[PDB]
């Protein structure tokens, strides 16, 4: 995957794709990799899938406790800090690449983190494999301060250029628009560029086209009755 984040005045949008890879092998057609640190703090994961998911889950617990002690919504910066330290004590052994986006009563923010513990600021941040491709689209057509109507289109177009010029990205574009004063709208499958075209045959066969040596019932659907 690739992650775009667009900070603008009204909120922040975060967009990433659903194509799962395990090496040049495509493991999954669909599998979302947008994770929730908090209800209002959505991140998405790139790099290794298991290193993103495993630490959003873990700090996901910590930030929830933190929220229950303050009895107020968590800050965005809190999430970044929790991650920074955790990555640093392994010395960048963990391969989490997260873009942390969020609304909270302080306002919209957008940050990124790299595996080693580096944290960057921005109004447009991009990361992952199709970073390079997503960035290109962005810098011509962008101006500072945009609406969500303008931005969701813009975000989305950039993830496309990750599909058609990078192979590490692909399939459907999923988007979470976290607005000020509203709950965050996870608009999953905003764009489906491509589906699998329907073939001309069914490969449904009568019984016996498979060779069978015996059969026997084995049940666990009961624990044995008297």
């Amino acid at each position: 995957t690739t992650i775009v984040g667009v900070k603008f005045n009204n909120g922040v949008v975060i967009a990433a794709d659903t194509r799962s890879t395990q090496g040049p092998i495509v493991a999954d057609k669909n599998c979302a990799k947008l994770h929730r640190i908090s209800p209002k703090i959505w991140c998405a994961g790139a790099g290794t899938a298991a290193d993103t998911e495993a630490v959003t889950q873990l700090i996901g617990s910590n930030i929830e406790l933190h929220s229950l002690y303050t009895s107020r919504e968590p800050r965005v910066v809190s999430a970044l800090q929790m991650l920074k330290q955790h990555l640093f004590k392994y010395q960048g052994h963990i391969g989490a690449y997260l873009i942390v986006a969020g609304v909270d009563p302080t306002g919209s923010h957008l940050f990124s983190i790299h595996a080693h513990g580096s944290t960057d600021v921005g109004y447009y941040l991009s990361l992952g494999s199709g970073s390079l491709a997503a960035m290109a689209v962005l810098e011509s057509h962008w101006k500072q301060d945009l609406t969500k109507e303008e931005a969701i289109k813009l975000a989305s177009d950039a993830i496309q250029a990750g599909i058609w010029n990078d192979l590490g990205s692909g399939s459907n574009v999923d988007v979470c628009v976290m607005e000020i004063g509203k709950d965050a709208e996870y608009l999953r499958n905003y764009l489906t560029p491509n589906v699998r075209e329907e073939k001309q045959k069914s490969y449904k066969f009568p019984r016996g086209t498979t060779a069978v040596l015996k059969e026997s019932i084995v049940n666990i659907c009961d624990i044995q009755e008297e």
Binding site: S38, S71, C176, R188
Partner: protein, 249 residues
């Protein structure tokens, strides 16, 4: 040096563990709280009190959220609940939200907090928490449940129960007022009316703390466009809302 490892809680020659009996006295000195299980929600309620008129009771919580679907309420000592609520949230995460990725069942959570009680009556330097907790909740495998956590280190499920100084009278109130089918709306009206007799001061919605583990609220979900997830089943009622239910008595 330290040599406190001799248990403070020990058997007496007439049987019983003496220290927890002492601690149970403190529960019947505390505020009164009650919980009625409806067939369409649970209501838990307690009374807010203050030692100063310049104290704010909107900065005072005695019903707290452990997980979005399981709330707790105490009677007993203020300090002892204050520490133990944090530990309840913490063990709910370590033992089911990092292992099974979700909030624990109501049965599971109650058991774990009873172990924390148990080991605060084991070994020296630790005396029990002098609270009894009603832990009402909802899980998806056994529906609504209402529990009562003892300072003993045991629990009991109930159909409706009360704890605190006015518990004995309050449970006799609920005995005629409980039935096989109940509504959550009428459960609230019973709970307030019973707690009227256990409050000696004001009876406003600002001084009566009410919370339901009713049904999900998708405006407290914090996100939309996932229909799979259901919002917080718990919902603490603001003072104005409680005043409406006082007029509905």
């Amino acid at each position: 040096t330290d040599r406190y490892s001799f248990s403070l809680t020990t058997f007496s020659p007439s049987g019983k563990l003496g220290q927890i009996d002492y601690a149970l006295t403190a529960v019947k000195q505390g505020v009164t709280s009650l919980g009625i299980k409806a067939t369409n929600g649970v209501v838990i309620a307690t009374e807010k009190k203050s030692s100063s008129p310049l104290a704010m009771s909107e900065t005072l919580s005695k019903v707290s959220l452990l997980t979005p679907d399981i709330g707790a309420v105490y009677s007993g000592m203020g300090p002892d609940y204050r520490v133990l609520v944090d530990k309840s949230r913490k063990v709910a995460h370590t033992s089911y939200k990092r292992i099974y990725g979700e909030y624990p069942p109501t049965k599971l959570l109650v058991s774990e907090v009873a172990k924390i009680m148990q080991e605060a009556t084991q070994s020296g330097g630790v005396r029990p928490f002098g609270v009894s907790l009603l832990i009402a909740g909802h899980d998806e495998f056994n529906g609504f449940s209402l529990y009562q956590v003892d300072p003993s280190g045991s629990y009991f499920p109930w159909k409706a129960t009360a704890i605190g100084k006015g518990s004995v009278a309050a449970k006799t109130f609920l005995e005629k007022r409980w039935n096989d089918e109940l509504e959550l709306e009428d459960a609230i009206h019973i709970a307030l009316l019973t707690l009227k007799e256990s409050v000696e001061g004001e009876f406003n919605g600002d001084t009566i703390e009410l919370a339901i583990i009713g049904d999900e609220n998708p405006d407290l979900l914090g996100y939309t466009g996932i229909p799979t997830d259901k919002g917080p089943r718990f919902r603490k009622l603001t003072s104005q809302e409680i005043n409406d239910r006082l007029e509905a008595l």
